Amino acid sequence: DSFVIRGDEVRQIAPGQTGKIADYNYKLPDDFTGCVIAWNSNNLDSKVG
Amino acid sequence: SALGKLQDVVNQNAQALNTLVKQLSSNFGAISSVLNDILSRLDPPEAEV
DSSP states (O other): OOOOOOGGGGGGSSTTOOSHHHHHTOOOOTTOOSOOOOOOOTTTSOOOO | OTTHHHHHHHHHHHHHHHHHHHGGGOOTTSSOSSHHHHHTTSOHHHHOO
């Protein structure tokens, strides 16, 4: 699963986590097994306007 | 006091049952002694702990 989120919301991508994005956008199971990879993309996903 | 032998059995049984029932009012290291309090105040990851 791949997507782009805000910098402060990466901590919400984790099992048993509550927040604006975990509740309404993307929810992880409590028995989740696997890996989470996240890196900054301020070079491609930023525009002056 | 002639019937102490028969009274002792009843006394020990009542004491054992009372102790078992009263054992429900201990934290055992948890925050609260009633699980309803825990399940209505904390998120699952440490509520389950």
